[PDB]
Design a protein around this ligand. Structure first.
Ligand SMILES: CCCCCCCCCCCCCCCCCC(=O)OC[C@H](COP(=O)([O-])OCC(O)COP(=O)([O-])OC[C@@H](COC(=O)CCCCCCCCCCCCCCCCC)OC(=O)CCCCCCCCCCCCCCCCC)OC(=O)CCCCCCCCCCCCCCCCC
Ligand SMILES: CCCCCCCCCCCCCCCCCC(=O)OC[C@H](COP(=O)([O-])OCC[N+](C)(C)C)OC(=O)CCCCCCCCCCCCCCCCC
Ligand SMILES: CCCCCCCCCCCCCCCCCC(=O)OC[C@H](COP(=O)(O)OCCN)OC(=O)CCCCCCCCCCCCCCCCC
Ligand SMILES: CCCCCCCCCCCCCCCCCC(=O)OC[C@H](COP(=O)(O)OCCN)OC(=O)CCCCCCCCCCCCCCCCC
Ligand SMILES: *C(=O)CCCCCCCCCCCCC
Lengths: 65, 122, 558, 155, 87, 49, 171, 79, 177, 76, 128, 62
């Protein structure tokens, strides 16, 4: 039996469409939290970005004259 | 990104221009500076068919990673550490580029303070 | 070797077989749309094997199988180029088209010309895979004009309606203005390089290549709806929903971007072409995303979405990152086809209602459609580790960290915020809140065709960026070192767009009535660009086509 | 059709104007021709240049797509003012105000891209360094000649 | 999709709208109740009722017909004309 | 069917196969693949000045 | 097949299958399924067709044109000899066109077969292509649509006057 | 063939935003005649719709649950 | 302005049409339903403030600057109903609206596929052709000298007759074929 | 129930034309395709060979396909 | 007060903001009634032929025939060569021909001068 | 007659296209040109039997 059209009220819902929609919403947040738990660097950062001012003049070769 | 403000709003006389640099010799300030060693042979990266942008000073990690990527088919998640090695050494190459940039900026500061010392003294 | 080229040609011949079936008919069909959908499913399965054995070794080839013509130094052969671009585009296009046709078996069920519709949609698919596999400029021009003409025939599907014919002729006009530049490029390569083949173009590698690249940029302007030649892509929402889903979001409109990605060894040695592509792409991705902020038809809003994503593709070509642009094409196909399918599911459920100001309360009425629309919007905006994260964010991670036009970068970031703004605008006016549609509820989505067709592109929109970006080889070096305010750029700008548009949406519940601002009148009437030039440039043509051309000279004086 | 319903020369006398307005099936007060400069319009009525998009859509038309009636004297450019073509309809924003906003927006965006091309943004790095004499044999250098040494050093 | 309209359905929906209107009492409302003369409404109220019909059934009645619909039976007959009911 | 099986319409195929002879004759004998002069420059008398 | 000198193919170097991961790839199974289901019946039908080719062996020939006198040693306005010269010149024109097409096929196949190292590894084919295009341009460019052996001879004579004047002005 | 319409006596605008609208109209002497027509949009199954942050977080509870299940499964599998 | 029955718009009609267009453009401005309903009663109060204006010249001026108010406050893209002109589904099925006379051009092998339909269509056409001359001689004696003044047609007066000029209005195609 | 008649123009003459078009094309299409298949299978493609000493070939003996040899012999 | 709407050639003034629409005078009643009368008479003359069963063909519209005869036939016999017609037939008649003539002649003289001076890159240009 | 689709639409066209590519296309020069496979240090060549030597030992960074 199909979904009957209704008037000025909430339409009929199937159990299957609701559990599939909740299942794919859970799949979205599962995959987001999973790849955020394992990678954590594609969003935040892979390697440290060094400070240029914190480098010494000997490794860069600046003789003071 | 602050150096963009230092070069545009400030002066471009002390900021090293991006297009043609180093303007200083490589031995200037370095006693017995050594070259950059290339690990992968020219013929080895020739046969590996690498992109001309990818044949830099650390393409040997890329050759090991691509051999792992070919050999681990279909398990395409089995060579994460070889990609990590290649990305880390590209990161170190970028750090060496940053060190060249900071060297050029500090030698232009040396030239700026040198001519200011000469204008104060003489 | 004998497997790769064989299944490569079997895919295209298999796509052409239902055209022979529909042309050799006498009976009334035992579900010809199911036959075409089964054929395109099997063509997807067939094209999967050359893609997998490309991911195994990197195996590219050329099939120059049929000699067609020899104009004295130009051997035009039927030549198919199976490279990385074909091996990643053909399974994505066949997968998206298979979902669009299982969608269309539900959506276009009331149409008595359903066999003509599936015939035209298959003809589009054939011309498009002629386009993306062509090895010379002539076969690419065949596929190019083919997707232009099937665009005409699928915009003007309800040919009795005046606006559909008007939009179809408009799309033909702007595409032929792009074809001026495409024929300019063919003319330049034939005269200066004696070839239309890609291999001799790439091997000769000319240096004075400003003029053919300007021709190719004009071709991509006409084809991918860049600024100046853009408004036909919003006008082209007058066709049916699976037309706008397949053709004018994900498959046809990337062909100007695909034309510029295809010619990457010329663009990587021409900084002027890169700068013009960067400026035009930033202009388009600003303008169309700004126009999307103040629209009320949902098909118009998602068309401005796909044109802003095409402008971003033009941006990331313009920073000399073509493979990221093509990864963004393969990524963008899934969630943008799914967003058009979910919008049209809302439209067909709400009895041909497309205006978002008469929607709402569909979070619990259409749950699967709401789920997939939220997933498509979050993949569009750059939610972490959806499919749209694996390309678009990297685009920003190369747009910041490169020798770039600074204003193009700033307009790229403003576009990145505007994507979040119109995405949560769609979710606000269409899914959230209280209902605004009329009183006779016929809301329903419980057809396995609709649910499975959105489901497979949902699996794509969740997993396909991860799967593809871990199956494609490196062709550039990914710039992975940047400061933390520069790494967190695209995410923070996207969340700022969400916050600003949520404040805008919560200013609408207030009981105040403000007069319209000039920014609202500018963005709502589409930068005033389709209002002026669609009136002025025909006028100055047609009076000049009557007064002086016909009447004065060619009936009296001459 | 016969001759006395066909167009003729320019109406000079008012009785020829009345005969034409009876011929063109309209009021004599509304009937104005194109001015007799010799451009060959003849005695055709100068309709006030309204696009057919502007008409009443809910009106019961003889030609519904054209929004046109039977026996109505058509516009001279009726092929031009169809709803597939040139429109003259009123707009919410003024015409010159649209032209000013469009020209200012387009020219200002062009000028800002010119400003950003004048001042480009970049990274605090040196140039990308490649081995083997800036990859001389890879970039198409001939094998018989030998270039200058392109040597990069550690830092 | 697209459910068929009937004169019972169009009649019951038009009367269902007019029984949710605070100037028409639900006990004097009939199928032939004239808006100005029998229910005592304004032409402004009549325009609001035809706009409520437009809100109800999802299409537009033009003004040359909206200025003459002066009973619920004329509304049901006009929607019967514009929807082709009882095939 | 007649046009498809025309016997080498305007001798194109022959001209390829003939080229496949002549290149093979002058790759092997060390000659250049095509001279810059169509005729022998020894049998040509130029106007003197 | 064809002649491997006019269409040169360098010796193929494929790597050995080196399975590193334990998961079996689909490509070997699909290759065996293609070898059984597709290669065998097509090969059997081709053997049947080739037996039927052997049941009637007959041959065709490559037509030869002996060299007639060219336009230089034909008299002026003597159509019987300069017709022969024109037919010879036109056959050589179409053959020179197919030589240029062979060198283009070489260059395109070299570029694809070398892949990304095409600029390094196809210098000889690009050099041959530059020489044959310079030769074809010096021989047949700018003649027009009504080209003939006379137009080609006059272009050759103008080029030889230019080369002689360039030789004279260098000394 | 009959679609049985519900009652017109159950669409009362108390407890709705139409209550607020009628209060603010009667505050200056105005009265709302089409409120009970609008009353079905704000009651029943269409009442209490989620916000945007609640529409985003659909399935996040069970998704985080299965996430913690899989993280515990790999942490008890790695040893 | 331009109407089939009247040659003009009365002032009452102009007021009602401006009120309707103001409410429609307002609903376009004011998307939410309770918010629009609040502003709709406010605008109804603004229209009923000068409902009882006797001076038609003053009401003309008030209507004119009310049109200026409506033009200053209009929405650029107002909500058009889908099958209303300017809508997205407007005149969509006009390519499916085949005229009825094309059934006359069918072949008899497919006319025999629907025997009852064409067997009834014969007496429909019979009804039309024996109604035509009666309704012509009806219209020729009621029309004044100089032609009819207004485009409206008289109804069927006698019992047994049909209303004049009726065949294309009755036998028009369905709006959803 | 309540099936509705769809007024449409006569699709008999267009379908009759297309049936006749396909029939009168296939009427000599199918014998030509079967005959070309039988020639390519049984009569078969000729082989390139050097011109022998003293053997002057006919003009139709310079062509590969048997139908091309038939055309160059019979008509040309 | 309010921004007044500016009419244009391609943006006409609305019916509501035009003042002459609000004319109440009896001569406007006469003009509107005569327009309604002519329109009603032409409507009746049309749909007596349109609804006729004995007619099977085309209701010929002499306004349409008159429009096509004006757009085709009436162009030459109502021409008078004067200053306006001759100057406008000399502007758009021999103007852009001269324009493209000098543009293409200039570019071809430039290209010929570069070719005979060995400047133009005509390296791989053997198709022409 | 349950899977006649994969026979008429796939398997017979794979037969036709394999016959076409095997006996008419690859029998002609440069029609199917393939990029040569990617050779790494450590590979074994099947046409020769020659083992490619590995790279230089790494100046390790980590
Ligand atoms: C088929 C009937 C259809 C219905 C009838 C009506 C048809 C239409 C009427 C036409 C009337 C005539 C018109 C004029 C044309 C005349 C013919 C002609 O000029 O032919 C030209 C041309 C030249 O042929 P030729 O000069 O006669 O012979 C060439 C050889 O030198 C010499 O030949 P060869 O000796 O090398 O080859 C001999 C060949 C015979 O020759 C022919 O077939 C040639 C004649 C066919 C011509 C057909 C033309 C009609 C139109 C065809 C296309 C449309 C068809 C309908 C729609 C299809 C779906 C779209 O032998 C075979 O076919 C046998 C092998 C079969 C292999 C398959 C099965 C193998 C496994 C079997 C297993 C079971 C048994 C196991 C046990 C065995 C025990 C022993 O022939 C063809 O083109 C043949 C058609 C097939 C070509 C390849 C098709 C695939 C290509 C794919 C890639 C390219 C396209 C990419 C598209 C991308 C998407 C857009
Ligand atoms: C169900 C249908 C399939 C047929 C079933 C029955 C037959 C069984 C299958 C076996 C078939 C027979 C054997 C294989 C076919 C013959 C092979 C062969 O050598 O044929 C000779 C030739 C091969 O070419 P060629 O190189 O030998 O010769 C070309 C001719 N000259 C040199 C004179 C120029 O022809 C074909 O193969 C014809 C088929 C081509 C397939 C593609 C057609 C596309 C048409 C598009 C038109 C417009 C083109 C525009 C684009 C151009 C490029 C930009
Ligand atoms: C991705 C990570 C998302 C979570 C981190 C960012 C959180 C944040 O700043 O959210 C801002 C905002 C919530 O704050 P606000 O809406 O002002 O207050 C009401 C709270 N329900 O708004 C939101 O949380 C809604 C927008 C979230 C965007 C998610 C996709 C990016
Ligand atoms: C990267 C470089 C970028 C360079 C940018 C600058 C160059 C391009 C400049 C813009 C050119 C295109 C814009 C102008 C013409 C647009 C015409 C058009 O699209 O008309 C559409 C119009 C209907 O539009 P619309 O009002 O939306 O209809 C729906 C409701 N009526 O439809 C109609 O009115 C129908 C009209 C039919 C007849 C058309 C007559 C005009 C033809 C214009 C040809 C232009 C050729 C340009 C050639 C350039 C060569 C270099
Ligand atoms: C100097 O600022 C280097 C960074 C690149 C140029 C400036 C980019 C500014 C916009 C991006 C960051 C925005 C953070 C909210």
């Amino acid at each position: 039996a199909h979904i009957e059209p209704r008037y000025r009220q909430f339409p009929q819902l199937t159990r299957s469409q609701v559990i599939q929609a909740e299942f794919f919403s859970a799949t979205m947040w599962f995959w987001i939290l999973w790849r955020f738990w394992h990678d954590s660097d594609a969003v935040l950062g892979h390697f440290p970005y060094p400070d240029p001012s914190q480098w010494t003049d000997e490794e860069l070769g600046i003789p003071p004259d | 990104g602050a150096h963009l403000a230092r070069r545009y709003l400030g002066d471009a006389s002390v900021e090293p221009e991006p297009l043609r640099m180093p303007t200083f010799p490589p031995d200037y300030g370095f006693p017995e500076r050594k070259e950059r060693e290339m690990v992968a042979t020219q013929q080895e990266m020739n046969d590996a068919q690498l992109v001309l942008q990818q044949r830099d000073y650390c393409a040997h990690y890329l050759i090991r990673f691509l051999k792992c990527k070919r050999d681990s088919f279909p398990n395409f998640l089995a060579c994460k550490h070889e990609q990590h090695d290649w990305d880390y050494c590209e990161h170190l190459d970028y750090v060496k580029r940053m060190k060249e940039f900071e060297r050029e900026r500090r030698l232009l500061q040396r030239k700026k303070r040198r001519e200011q010392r000469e204008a104060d003294m003489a | 070797m004998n497997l790769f080229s064989s299944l490569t040609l079997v895919t295209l011949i298999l796509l052409t077989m239902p055209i022979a079936a529909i042309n050799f008919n006498t009976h009334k069909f035992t579900n010809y749309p199911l036959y075409v959908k089964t054929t395109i499913s099997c063509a997807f399965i067939t094209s999967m094997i050359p893609t997998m054995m490309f991911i195994h070794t990197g195996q590219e080839m050329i099939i120059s199988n049929w000699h067609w013509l020899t104009i004295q130094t130009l051997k035009l052969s039927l030549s198919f180029k199976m490279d990385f671009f074909s091996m990643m585009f053909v399974p994505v296009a066949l997968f998206v088209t298979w979902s669009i046709m299982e969608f269309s078996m539900w959506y276009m069920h009331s149409d008595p010309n359903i066999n003509q519709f599936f015939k035209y949609l298959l003809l589009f698919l054939i011309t498009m895979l002629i386009l993306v596999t062509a090895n010379n400029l002539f076969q690419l021009f065949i596929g190019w004009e083919g997707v232009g003409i099937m665009s005409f025939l699928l915009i003007g599907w309800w040919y009795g309606r005046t606006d559909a014919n008007t939009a179809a002729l408009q799309a033909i006009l702007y595409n032929r203005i792009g074809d001026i530049g495409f024929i300019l490029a063919m003319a330049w390569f034939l005269i200066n390089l004696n070839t239309w083949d890609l291999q001799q173009i790439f091997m000769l590698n000319p240096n004075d290549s400003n003029l053919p690249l300007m021709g190719l940029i004009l071709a991509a302007t006409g084809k991918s709806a860049q600024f100046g030649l853009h408004p036909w892509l919003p006008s082209a929402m007058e066709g049916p929903t699976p037309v706008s889903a397949l053709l004018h979001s994900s498959t046809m409109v990337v062909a100007g971007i695909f034309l510029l990605i295809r010619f990457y060894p010329l663009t990587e040695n021409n900084k002027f072409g890169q700068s013009i592509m960067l400026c035009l792409g930033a202009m388009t991705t600003l303008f169309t995303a700004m126009c999307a902020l103040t629209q009320n038809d949902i098909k118009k809003i998602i068309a401005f979405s796909t044109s802003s994503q095409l402008g971003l593709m033009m941006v990331t070509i313009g920073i000399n990152q073509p493979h990221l642009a093509f990864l963004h094409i393969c990524t963008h196909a899934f969630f943008k086809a799914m967003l058009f399918m979910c919008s049209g599911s809302i439209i067909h459920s709400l009895n041909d209602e497309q205006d978002i100001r008469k929607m709402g309360g569909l979070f619990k009425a259409m749950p699967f459609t709401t789920t997939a629309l939220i997933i498509g919007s979050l993949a569009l905006t750059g939610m972490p580790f959806l499919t749209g994260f694996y390309s678009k964010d990297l685009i920003i991670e190369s747009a910041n960290t490169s020798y770039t036009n600074a204003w193009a970068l700033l307009m790229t970031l403003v576009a990145t915020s505007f994507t979040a703004i119109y995405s949560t605008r769609i979710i606000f006016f269409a899914l959230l809140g209280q209902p605004r549609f009329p009183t006779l509820i016929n809301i329903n989505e419980n057809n396995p065709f609709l649910i499975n067709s959105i489901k497979r592109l949902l699996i794509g929109s969740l997993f396909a960026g991860f799967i593809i970006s871990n199956n494609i080889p490196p062709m550039t070096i990914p710039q992975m070192t940047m400061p933390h305010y520069l790494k967190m750029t695209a995410l923070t700008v996207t969340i700022l767009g969400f916050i600003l548009a949520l404040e805008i949406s919560n200013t609408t519940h207030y009981l105040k009535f403000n007069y319209p601002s000039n920014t609202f009148k500018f963005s709502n009437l589409l930068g005033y660009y389709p209002t002026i030039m669609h009136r002025l440039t025909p006028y100055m043509n047609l009076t000049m086509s009557q007064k002086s051309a016909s009447s004065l000279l060619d009936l009296i004086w001459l | 059709i016969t001759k006395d319903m066909l167009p003729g020369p320019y109406p000079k006398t008012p009785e020829e104007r009345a005969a034409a307005a009876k011929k063109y099936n309209m009021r004599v007060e509304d009937y104005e021709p194109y001015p007799d400069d010799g451009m060959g319009y003849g005695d055709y009525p100068k309709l006030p240049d309204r696009s057919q998009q502007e008409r009443d859509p809910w009106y019961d038309w003889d030609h519904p797509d054209l929004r046109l009636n039977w026996g109505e004297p058509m516009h001279w450019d009726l092929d031009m003012y169809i709803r597939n073509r040139v429109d003259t309809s009123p707009t919410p924003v003024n015409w010159n105000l649209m032209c000013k906003h469009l020209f200012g927006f387009v020219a200002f965006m062009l000028f800002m891209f010119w400003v950003g091309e004048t001042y480009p943004t970049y990274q605090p790095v040196g140039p990308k360094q490649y081995p083997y004499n800036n990859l001389y044999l890879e970039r198409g250098g001939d094998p018989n000649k030998e270039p200058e040494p392109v040597v990069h050093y550690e830092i | 999709d697209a459910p068929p309209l009937t004169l019972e359905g169009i009649k019951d929906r038009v009367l269902y709208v007019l029984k949710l209107y605070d100037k028409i009492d639900p006990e004097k409302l009939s199928v032939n109740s004239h808006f100005m003369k029998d229910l005592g409404l304004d032409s402004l109220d009549q325009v609001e009722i035809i706009m409520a019909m437009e809100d109800e059934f999802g299409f537009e009645i033009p003004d040359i017909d909206a200025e003459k619909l002066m009973c619920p039976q004329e509304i049901v007959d006009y929607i019967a004309d514009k929807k082709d009911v009882y095939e | 069917t007649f046009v498809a099986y025309l016997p080498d319409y305007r001798m194109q195929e022959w001209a390829r196969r003939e080229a496949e002879r002549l290149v093979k004759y002058r790759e092997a004998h060390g000659l250049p693949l095509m001279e810059s002069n169509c005729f022998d420059p020894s049998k040509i008398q130029l106007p003197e000045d | 097949s064809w002649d491997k000198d006019v269409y040169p193919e360098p010796p193929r170097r494929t790597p050995a299958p080196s399975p590193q991961t334990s998961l079996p790839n689909p490509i070997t199974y699909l290759t065996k399924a293609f070898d059984l289901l597709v290669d065998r019946p097509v090969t059997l039908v081709r053997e049947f067709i080739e037996r039927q080719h052997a049941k009637n062996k007959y041959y065709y020939y490559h037509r030869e044109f002996r060299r007639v006198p060219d336009i230089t040693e034909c008299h002026e306005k003597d159509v019987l000899c300069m017709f022969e010269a024109e037919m010879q010149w036109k056959r050589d024109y179409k053959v020179d066109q197919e030589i240029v097409n062979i060198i283009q096929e070489r260059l395109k196949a070299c570029q694809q077969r070398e892949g990304e190292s095409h600029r390094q590894n196809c210098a000889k084919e690009l050099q041959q292509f530059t020489q044959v295009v310079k030769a074809y341009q010096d021989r047949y460019h700018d003649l027009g649509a009504h080209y003939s052996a006379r137009k080609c001879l006059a272009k050759q004579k103008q080029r030889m006057l230019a080369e002689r004047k360039a030789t004279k002005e260098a000394a | 063939s009959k679609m049985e319409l519900p009652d017109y006596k159950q669409w009362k605008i108390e407890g709705t935003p139409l209550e607020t609208v009628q209060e603010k109209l009667a505050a200056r002497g105005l009265r709302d005649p089409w409120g009970r027509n609008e009353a079905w949009r704000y009651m029943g199954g269409f009442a209490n719709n989620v916000s945007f942050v609640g529409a985003l977080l659909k399935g996040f509870k069970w998704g985080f649950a299965a996430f913690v299940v899989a993280v515990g499964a790999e942490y008890y599998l790695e040893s | 302005a331009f109407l089939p029955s009247a040659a003009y718009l009365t002032h009452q009609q102009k007021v009602l049409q401006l009120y309707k267009r103001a409410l429609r453009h307002l609903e376009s401005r004011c998307v939410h339903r309770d918010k629009y309903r609040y502003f709709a009663c406010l605008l109804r109060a603004r229209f009923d403030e000068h409902k009882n204006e006797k001076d038609m010249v003053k009401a003309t001026q008030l209507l004119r600057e009310a049109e200026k108010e409506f033009w200053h406050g209009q929405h650029p893209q107002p909500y058009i109903f889908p099958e209303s002109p300017g809508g997205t589904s407007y005149e969509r099925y006009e390519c499916y609206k085949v005229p009825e006379w094309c059934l006359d051009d069918w072949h008899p092998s497919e006319k025999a596929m629907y025997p009852d339909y064409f067997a009834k269509r014969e007496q429909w056409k019979k009804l039309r052709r024996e109604s035509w001359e009666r309704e012509v001689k009806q219209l020729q004696e009621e029309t004044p000298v100089g032609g009819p003044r207004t485009e409206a047609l008289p109804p069927a007066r006698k019992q047994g007759d049909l209303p004049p000029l009726w065949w294309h209005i009755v036998t028009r195609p369905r709006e959803r074929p | 129930g309540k099936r509705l008649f769809i007024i449409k123009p006569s699709g008999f003459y267009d379908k009759r034309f297309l049936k006749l078009l396909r029939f009168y094309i296939l009427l000599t299409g199918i014998p030509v395709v079967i005959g070309i298949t039988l020639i390519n299978v049984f009569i078969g493609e000729a082989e390139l060979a050097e011109i022998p000493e003293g053997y002057v070939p006919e003009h139709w003996e310079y062509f590969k396909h048997p139908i091309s040899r038939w055309i160059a012999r019979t008509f040309f | 007060s309010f921004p007044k709407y500016e009419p244009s050639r391609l943006a006409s003034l609305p019916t509501t903001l035009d003042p002459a629409e609000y004319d109440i005078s009896s001569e406007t009643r006469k003009a509107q009634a005569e327009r309604l009368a002519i329109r009603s008479r032409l409507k009746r003359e049309y749909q007596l032929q349109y609804n006729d069963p004995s007619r099977r063909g085309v209701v010929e519209d002499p306004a349409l025939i008159r429009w096509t005869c004006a757009r085709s036939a009436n162009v030459y016999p109502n021409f008078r060569p004067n200053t306006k017609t001759s100057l406008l037939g000399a502007l758009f008649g021999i103007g852009p021909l001269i324009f493209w003539y000098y543009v293409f002649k200039t570019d071809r003289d430039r290209k010929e001068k570069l070719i005979q001076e060995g400047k133009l890159d005509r390296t791989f240009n053997i198709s022409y | 007659r349950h899977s006649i689709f994969a026979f008429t639409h796939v398997l017979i066209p794979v037969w036709i296209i394999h016959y076409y590519l095997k006996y008419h296309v690859t029998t002609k020069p440069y029609t199917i040109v393939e990029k040569k496979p990617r050779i790494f240090p450590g590979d074994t060549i099947l046409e020769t039997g020659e083992v490619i030597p590995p790279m230089k030992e790494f100046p390790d960074q980590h």
